[PDB]
Symmetry: D2
Subunit: 477 residues, 4 copies
Amino acid sequence: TYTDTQLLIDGEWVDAASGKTIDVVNPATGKPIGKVAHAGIADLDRALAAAQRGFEAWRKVPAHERAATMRKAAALVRERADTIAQLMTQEQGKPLTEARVEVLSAADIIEWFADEGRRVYGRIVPPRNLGAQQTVVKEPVGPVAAFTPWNFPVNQVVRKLSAALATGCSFLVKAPEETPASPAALLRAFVDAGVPAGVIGLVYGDPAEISSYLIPHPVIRKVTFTGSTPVGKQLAALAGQHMKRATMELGGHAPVIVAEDADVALAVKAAGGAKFRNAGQVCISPTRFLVHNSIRDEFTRALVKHAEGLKVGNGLEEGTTLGALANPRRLTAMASVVDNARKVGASIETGGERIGAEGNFFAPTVIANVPLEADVFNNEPFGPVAAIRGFDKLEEAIAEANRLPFGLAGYAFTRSFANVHLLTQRLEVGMLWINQPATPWPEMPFGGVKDSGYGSEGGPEALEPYLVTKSVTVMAV
Amino acid sequence: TYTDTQLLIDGEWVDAASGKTIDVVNPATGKPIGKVAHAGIADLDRALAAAQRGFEAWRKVPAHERAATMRKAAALVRERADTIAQLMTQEQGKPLTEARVEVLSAADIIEWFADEGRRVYGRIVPPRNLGAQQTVVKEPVGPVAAFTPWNFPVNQVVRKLSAALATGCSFLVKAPEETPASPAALLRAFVDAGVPAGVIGLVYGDPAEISSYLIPHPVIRKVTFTGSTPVGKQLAALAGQHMKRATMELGGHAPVIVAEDADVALAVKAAGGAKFRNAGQVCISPTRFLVHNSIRDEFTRALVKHAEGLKVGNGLEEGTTLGALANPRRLTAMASVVDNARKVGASIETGGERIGAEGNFFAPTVIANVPLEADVFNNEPFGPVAAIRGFDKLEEAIAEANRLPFGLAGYAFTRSFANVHLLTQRLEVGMLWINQPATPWPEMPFGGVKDSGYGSEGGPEALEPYLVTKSVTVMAV
Amino acid sequence: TYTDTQLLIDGEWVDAASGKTIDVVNPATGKPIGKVAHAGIADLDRALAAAQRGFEAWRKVPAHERAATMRKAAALVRERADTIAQLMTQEQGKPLTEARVEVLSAADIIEWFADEGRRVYGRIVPPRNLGAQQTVVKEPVGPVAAFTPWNFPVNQVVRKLSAALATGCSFLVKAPEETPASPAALLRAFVDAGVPAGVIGLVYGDPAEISSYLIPHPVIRKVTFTGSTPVGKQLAALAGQHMKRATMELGGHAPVIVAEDADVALAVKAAGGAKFRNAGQVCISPTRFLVHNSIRDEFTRALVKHAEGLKVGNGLEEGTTLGALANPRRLTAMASVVDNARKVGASIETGGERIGAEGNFFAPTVIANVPLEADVFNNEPFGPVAAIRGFDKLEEAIAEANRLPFGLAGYAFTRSFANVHLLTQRLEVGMLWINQPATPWPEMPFGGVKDSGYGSEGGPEALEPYLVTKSVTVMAV
Amino acid sequence: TYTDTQLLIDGEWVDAASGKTIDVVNPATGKPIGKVAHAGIADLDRALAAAQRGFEAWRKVPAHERAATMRKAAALVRERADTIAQLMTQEQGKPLTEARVEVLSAADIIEWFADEGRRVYGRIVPPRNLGAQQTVVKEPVGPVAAFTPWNFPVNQVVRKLSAALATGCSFLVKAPEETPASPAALLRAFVDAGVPAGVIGLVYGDPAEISSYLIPHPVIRKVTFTGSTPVGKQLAALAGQHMKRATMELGGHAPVIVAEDADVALAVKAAGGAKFRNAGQVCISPTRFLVHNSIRDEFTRALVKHAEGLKVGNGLEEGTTLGALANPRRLTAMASVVDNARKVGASIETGGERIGAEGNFFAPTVIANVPLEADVFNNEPFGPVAAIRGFDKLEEAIAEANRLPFGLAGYAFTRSFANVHLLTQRLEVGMLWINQPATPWPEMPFGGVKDSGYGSEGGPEALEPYLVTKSVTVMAV
């Protein structure tokens, strides 16, 4: 059953001071299922004061003790995976099998970052004067304000939170209001694991009012944001105005390059399965399919058959492989994308229409003969729609893949080492997957370039935005 | 003799399209000595087009060949050290001996970064699937727009330029208009060393108009700024609005902690000499002298005697150890700082008045019994003035040193390991020097925290802002 | 109750083919308590064949799966800590509290190395030709033959085994015959955790015959030995004769430097407690106490009082802080060391005689006025005896601490940063502890120099002896 | 003109105390050209005493000053490249063009290691107790004894010497007696560059007597050897007997795998040119050509034509691409290898006989249809002879390439990423080159596995054998 969500301030789950709440609806039915507290300025003041105290206590806990507490939270998350997955499905719409995968991988993310926190190594530099010692020490930056979207309510919070806790920083996150229950369950596991009060905080309310107050507040030292590019540009400008360290993970437009020597069956299974994961509402979802003209037609038929094999329905019902879209605004965007494709002369091979009249169900869509001016090839669709366009020379495919200002993810399918070497050097993406779907592991860096933002949420590089570099030189006399 | 300065666009030294120029005056006499080209929008268009082509060519040159070209430029800089130093002294005001030290250390900076460019190492991660290869590759971010102040016309340009060239990026810098000749001489050495046309560019003009056009331009991928905090906040907000990667080095307010067990003679020689380097117009200049009450009076007398031993005059004349201030606005700031100190009850131990009536000469000033509300203890003076305040407990000195939002540099003097360990952990600075003056080496990270900005200009960390991290996973089938 | 010990070959606990056994006696009573299998050449043949197959399977298991199996073994070790500790006490003699600490710290060692195995990172080098890729890959060396002493039966096996398993190597260890039960219990936990058959092997018998056969065998690729220097020289020569990679951890002679400004009470508590840990039968046991003459007499009285406060008895009995020596040969060595000290003119401040007539109980001994020619100051005593000698200048203490060819551990006590910096630079030891007793953590390198051997058993450096470095350059054409 | 060679002891070029000398002959004519001093035990005593003093002085010189001295030596080597090359050709036999390449690449090796010495970084570990500091410091091991062969008289000395000098160690090398002049010229450049007396030493004489005395001497702390496997086993056993850290670079047996999809013309040009470099007297010379049966016959014809295009003659004469073998023992080995191949049924496609009657000239030899039992396929030929054998499946080629106990180098030629990935994982070699000849750069690790020794002479790993790892933990109280 779906439960109501409160705010987490200073270790206590509390209501807002004014008592205001926001209704939460099920995307598959459109009916209310619960509500979440709507925090005001007064609640943010208490959260910011608790965040300052939490940073003081957490930075004094040794790294091996912070790792032990973090790994106990990961065990609690893994124990409660079924319950958290059910909350995620009801509020977000993804199938129960996909929700369970996200929760289990979140526990894997916590465990890796817990060990990474014990390996934040300083440096000893060979001194210019042997009578002095030159060292480079690493310290937590301080309290962190975070903002996360609804696409992966638990996974997109767990990466920011794990990196902040592993370095010794405090963490105050505004989770998405449309999917509040599963992020609250993730933070409840950390509270039960023994994270001290004030080290972690959770708020909900008006996104614009909360971000406008936390970012300029002197307590906050670091801002991290994941979401849309237009919103990220607003918050990055505000962070720059007050000289706050910031990292941005924004929307992407992932190209897929299917070379002449590609395995067509492997490309359809990998890129097709990655296309419809989370109903295409993923920042790294394969969007622009650039298929070589020699095997383009065979690729299109197989992709259409794969899309027609998906079962669309309620995510709680067994056998569902494609759930409802998270919000009605995605339904409007899907209709606009398909309508524009028809106008510009593209062909709708399958899907392209709303299923039913209740919920946010949209059929998986494959579009062929897409011109370069179509909206689907310039703006991120963020839905279950694939666009296919042919090419002759691999240099033409690379040039098209680099045309847009989005630099987040890319995909390729080829057999020769020369093609792999060329695509590694030339594609302007933060992540490249060849001959397989995306497998984002905690040990691999996760981030984009250009308008997709900057900063990494995986690997050892994920801790650098939360750390300050200090040069120390002591003359021994 | 002082020469006029042109713009460097696409490998050619050219005038502005409109022919406009800006007069350059000698700070020690107030008389014109030359002029510098005033670039408009049209010249910026040619520079941006050349920067895009320069990035294409420079990124294809192997790292060992880029290092060889960089080291040849360092040899030319070292050969021309005397000529460059004379230009710096006439336009900026620092003594000829200090100018020569800056130029020679610039060549040392180039050589270190040339070797560091050959050690930009990728990573191979143990794969989750043995049939696939997981790698992390490093690539240049792209064209870089830079903005530098007049305090160190050559050194503050050479750090940004060396890091950009070592990673393979192109570099377009707006050097300060009041000190144009010595930055132009530094870039001339790189042109003579064989840097391809368009890889490096140099412009002058209206700082607001140039920054407002280069930062949002799609060609620019990375912005780096050094200067005042209020200006840095404007450019960081603009960079965030267009999602451009940015690094900021802003003003600081350096505290000095003289502990009970400190060597008083060593503290006066080290902190006093570092105070009046470049007439205190350094972002890491020791400003807030927190001296233990047991040896405060002895410290004050020795510091006053050290200040009175300085010879004030033209930087070209031999025997001068303190030159003229760089611009008349520093003269007004010095008078305002001393006047406010008198009002709040502080005592002027020495100096505190303008010397003569021609130029920008100000006497070295020592102020004692400074209250916490005085302007010198809250705002960065950026001049040859030291403020002394006593303390009893070391925890009180640490709390005062962390009170201001400036986090750039700190200084300490102590003998016990416990004091060194405590100050290393507690002081919120990017750089700490104990028992010695500041010795910024190219291998040591250089940067601040909080309102002093973010990012490092030394060590291996200096290359990270100019590099993009790409995760590559290739399934072998 | 004490159990008999079998061999672990190919995943099965089996007896020797000939059925021969070796009696195990309790060091505190001298009575038999059990027996251990005595393997011959035929059993070594089966173990070597199984080791080759175990390396093939284990090297194909992904690092994250090997880490999961290793952490499950650590949980089993922690669950069975009480049972393993009782076996260790009965066969080795250390108190039950010390035995429990060793077992619990062994589980901590396994967990750190499990995570370290996932961070064995390759390198990507900037190529001289952009058309080619230069990489440095890391691979397991292969099957490993190990030899461990009786001082820490579980801890000294767990460090070699954890490093071998984390890199993907197979591991065949000859555990000490006098303490066979607790090493067998540690390896039983790895078998129960799911380590495949042949990856781990355990043998007992004649140490000379086993080492003479495993080291030259073509299956073995790496040899690791911990024990006495004379035996290590024999096995290192044999390894060199057959070009087998080898690491050696041999005996040490740890100096303690108590400076003029040292905290005398802290030095007595830290160095005195570390002296009598495991009854001084530790390779890093503080042996040569060089105490400044100004506080030498006060230090000697406090150390004598600390030694007299130890309770000597059976390790199973509660309240015992000093157990029996592990074997009768240590009793003879203790008598010889004390007798030689009396002859050379040294004074026995406390202890120096055998306690009782049954077992291997020796009183804690403090010797003062020790000359430089005494046996205790030249040969490693490996017992509960401390030797004290005075000094005037710190340079004299450093010279004495570097006189012996032993380079394993050192201790110091001082307050000034200059003394800490000087001792860090000058002391020829692999490990230095100042103002505290030894705290060997898995993340810290553990090894010696000169006659103490080479190679590290902690930190990331502990994996290098088990890894091979391969340069790969592929031209893309 | 060829000059006589003296010993370098304590900064002075001196004769042996007994005055004994060893004649040096030209391999291309068999006539004497000079002589070299023959050092005895007494001269080794002076060299060892000077080495101890040289280590004391050199370890106190800062890394940036040691790098400056090293780079000045590299400039002198590059200036004197022509003179050094002429000495190398007359005494060793390789063509003048090859000798010049070796000398110029030696200067490149020095420059890389000079910069690498400034980046010997320590580590700061996150402490378990926040009141203490845990650091890992790196220090020079001490005096180093080196032994080098005649194949690359300058290059094989320069790698050991550059690594020793960059870490601060002293260096005493026994250069080969048959090629003494060019190693002496390389060390003369370091003396002229300002390396202090005793830091570098050079001796000649009886190799067995010198190695038997330097290795056990207490002054020597590290031994490094390059040469044949049987001799390396003798010196590694002696080093183990006295517990001296040792690294071994021994002979190899390089396989070449020409896959089905290989570029046959590229494989012949790359592997054929690498085969006859230095007349095949290289430890990484391609020896066992495993060519796929589909293109085996075409490969054999092209390789034969390439061998017949070589011009054999005196290395000083212009147009010579294959010089004389270095010593008459190589002539006997070449005849024995060809004779055994005829007996076992192999076919001599070209060459296989001595050219002329004066000198050590042997014709380039290509052997086809080589059985697995032939001497050329089991023992390292170390000459200008290639052996070709066909295969059907790539797994069969990999199994053959891993059959011998030699693990130094490997070569491959393929186009698919799957083949590259498979060969990288499976080939038991220290170095792998695909689609190109060997390009050993100073930044790439250089070393073997199994009977080829251990340790690396390139990359950052080349400094580890000359460094000691010290754990330091200081409790701040």
